[PDB]
């Protein structure tokens, strides 16, 4: 199993009272084992995180960029991030897929982009709950990975990194059973290595998403092909350091 | 007679320390002897050096966008969260977002209201595109824009809310719109105020004009009527900048 990655999404969320004592919190958190954790704040958070964030161990990513800077009134360019120091972003989340029109090839416009500019990637895929009731799970997912993949070149997959996220999961409370999650990771994993290889196939990095807690981390972690979370709600809580643990 | 003229600078998404420090340290260096409420609006990343920066008086710090509540809505900023950090002015309903990011006449007017029920100080965009005008609807979009956010803002909200109106037909052709093109939209716009939310409400609302900004057309279109200050793209990335700020004394 390769280096497994811990990362918190806050999403829309975050005060300065509210997140300086979390920072101070994982800060002190120490962690033996091998393991990547990312945290990523919302922009107006990303600098006092990176002010504050001082454990070796995690790295700071943004929640979305567009691919140039320029007239785009109210975006943040990958250029504008790379020069602030920031090199991991979070691409195509269920939520800008569904609330702002990402389509699958609007985010692998900014995957290519992202890749090409040496950032390290988390790119989200998922089903919605009627895509899993009509039986389409397969197709949808493979789908949303084909567009990526199809702009990709072998050396990027090195940074990119694999999440899944039942939309049917999401702040729903209703997590998948670690034999949900493992049938669909096993899935993604048996695409890649029938078009790229073993090698990238046995390093890819495939998270977890949708209502993860200190509770059914370490069962999820158990399974053959899940390399760690990407969190949500229970991210913005201490809890957050039992789960990074739960990837020993 | 005229309302106390705003210049706002819109960075859109542009920047970096190397370059915005300089121009920070130029504004902080300049001084405006008349009354004139200055705007400088850096992307969300941005906001936190300028902050900790920024000394001139008359400036007041702007966000470019936001969304109305806190939750799970990856990669936005809500109204809450900027209040938090002590932003009291928004920039809502630009042409960018109304046209690349869905934004529709809907949308602009329930982040509006959200905003001026929170205590923000509000820009709101409004304008016609290249095939409206030439369809002879400028003043058929413009007033509807309008009158959307009208509907959902009470009488007092008028207060904290401010006009800027965007030639996007003029921006996107890449012609450029005289003074007197400016002014026969701001009059339009300014009648409507009149007659619909009253006499009071139209003599202190402030309509910026918000197409190509430069220290040279600055000072002509500056002194037309209804045009009480500028919503700057490009040129607010230079020194010319406080040029553009004089042009309103």
Sequence with gaps: ???????????????ESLLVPLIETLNAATFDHDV????????????????RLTNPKFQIAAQNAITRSGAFTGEVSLQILKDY?????????????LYYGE?????????AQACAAGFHVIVCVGETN?????????????????????????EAWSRVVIAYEPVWAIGT????????????????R???????????????????????????????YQMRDINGFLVGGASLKPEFVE?????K
């Design 173 to 188: 409370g209703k997590v998948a059973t670690p034999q949900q999650a493992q049938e669909v990771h096993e899935l993604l």
């Design 36 to 51: 990547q954790c990312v945290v990523a704040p919302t922009f107006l958070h990303i600098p006092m995180t990176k002010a």
């Design 130 to 154: 009627e895509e899993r009731e009509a039986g389409r799970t397969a197709a949808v997912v493979l789908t949303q990975l084909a567009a990526v993949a199809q702009k990709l070149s072998k």
């Design 1 to 15: 199993k390769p280096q497994p990655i811990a990362a918190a999404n806050w999403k829309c969320n975050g005060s």
């Design 85 to 97: 120091g920031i090199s991991w972003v979070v691409l195509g989340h269920s939520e800008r897929r």
């Design 103 to 111: 389509t699958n090839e609007i985010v692998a416009e900014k995957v």
């Design 243 to 247: 789960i990074i643990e739960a990837t």
């Design 190 to 220: 048996r695409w890649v290595r029938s078009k790229l290889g073993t090698d990238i196939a046995a390093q890819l990095r495939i998270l977890y998403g949708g209502s993860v807690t200190a509770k059914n981390a370490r069962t999820l």
